[PDB]
Design a protein around this ligand. Structure first.
Ligand SMILES: CSC[C@@H](NC(=O)[C@H](CCS)NC(=O)CCC[C@H](N)C(=O)O)C(=O)O
Ligand SMILES: [Fe+3]
Length: 329
């Protein structure tokens, strides 16, 4: 059996204030965790995650099959050709257990210039009827902005950790244009649990989602208190303990590109567990045209042999590749 991964709990509350020394001591902890397993829990983050979990459970448990087709992304409903990212991702009973609802920046409205131009990766969110889900759309849009504020503070900590000014990433992470997404994922309890919805790793571990790196700058994740994640380290796959009070943070592959793999995007996977639970990631994406020049914090001159890559190019190519590698969610 499997060793516990080192995933420290880091009090991120100084990243919201003006005590610069204290912010540097948090940045050192972020640097250490990014160089070790690649994961940490952010604690003292200020978000009401119990209420997030309760509002998400009331949505998942009350939405009906009719509403799921009406919200479905194009992979499930050919009539919704504009919904590639945002909307409902249906389960397939007997075959695929997980189901989810994704939404994007609430400022992507019909009049937004990138929506008018039909720019890839930008979509107008879709929502269930307000009378059937009272308060849900308002709650979820407010949650987007709560977790955007936490993510901006975390990006200040990452910037300081890499030897940069605290706005080095945050200046590209803006309310009018971020490509960040929230996904409200339901993993169900099922009796019996269909074998077709269970994958098997080469080491024999039963999985709900195979190994991958995230397509993100960073990922800011709330999960229920049911252990399920594992991280590949030099000593093999190790279990990430659950903590339903903190946010689990890790880097995505855009951070690995920008830092020339100094902060790796850690490879991780989701064990199969027959439990009713929630996985609620926020993928911190930049704007479509955002380009950060790659650098290397292990080299004296900081220079890297990597080409600049716009975030829009990164994101479009990565979302397709992850579907190809690990299946349509
Ligand atoms: C420990 S993986 C986190 C979560 N999985 C996901 O959120 C999955 C696997 C990627 S990490 N998300 C995805 O990558 C699917 C689409 C990305 C998103 N819909 C978007 O367009 O921004 C899960 O299975 O618990
Ligand atoms: Fe992931």
């Amino acid at each position: 059996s499997v060793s516990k991964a080192n995933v420290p709990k880091i009090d991120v509350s100084p990243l919201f204030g003006d005590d610069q020394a204290a912010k540097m001591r948090v940045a050192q902890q972020i640097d250490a965790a990014s160089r070790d397993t690649g994961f940490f829990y952010a604690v003292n983050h200020g978000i009401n995650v119990q209420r997030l979990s309760q509002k998400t459970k009331e949505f998942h448990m009350s939405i009906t099959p009719e509403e799921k087709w009406d919200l479905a992304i194009r992979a499930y409903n050919k009539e919704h050709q504009d919904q590639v990212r945002a909307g409902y991702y249906l389960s397939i009973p007997g075959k695929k257990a997980v189901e989810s609802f994704c939404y994007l920046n609430p400022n992507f409205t019909p009049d937004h210039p990138r929506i008018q131009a039909k720019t890839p990766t930008h979509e107008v969110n879709v929502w269930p009827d307000e009378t059937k889900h009272p308060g849900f759309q308002d709650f979820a849009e407010q949650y987007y902005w709560d977790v955007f504020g936490l993510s901006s503070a975390l990006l200040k900590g990452y910037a300081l950790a890499l030897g940069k000014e605290e706005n080095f990433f945050a200046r590209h992470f803006k309310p009018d244009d971020t490509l960040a997404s929230v996904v409200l994922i339901r993993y169900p309890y099922l009796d019996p649990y269909p074998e077709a919805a269970i994958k098997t790793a080469a080491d024999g571990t039963k999985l709900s989602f195979e190994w991958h790196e995230d397509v993100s700058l960073i990922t800011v994740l709330y999960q229920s208190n049911v252990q399920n994640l594992q991280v590949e380290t030099a000593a093999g796959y190790q279990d990430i303990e659950a903590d339903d009070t903190g946010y689990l943070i890790n880097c995505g592959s855009y951070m690995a590109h920008l830092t020339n793999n100094y902060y790796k995007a850690p490879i991780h996977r989701v064990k199969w567990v027959n439990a009713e639970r929630q996985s609620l990631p926020f993928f911190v994406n930049l704007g479509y045209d955002s380009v950060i020049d790659p650098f290397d914090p292990r080299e004296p001159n900081g220079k890297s042999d990597r080409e600049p890559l716009s975030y829009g190019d990164y994101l479009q190519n990565g979302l397709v590749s992850l579907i190809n590698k690990n299946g349509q969610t």
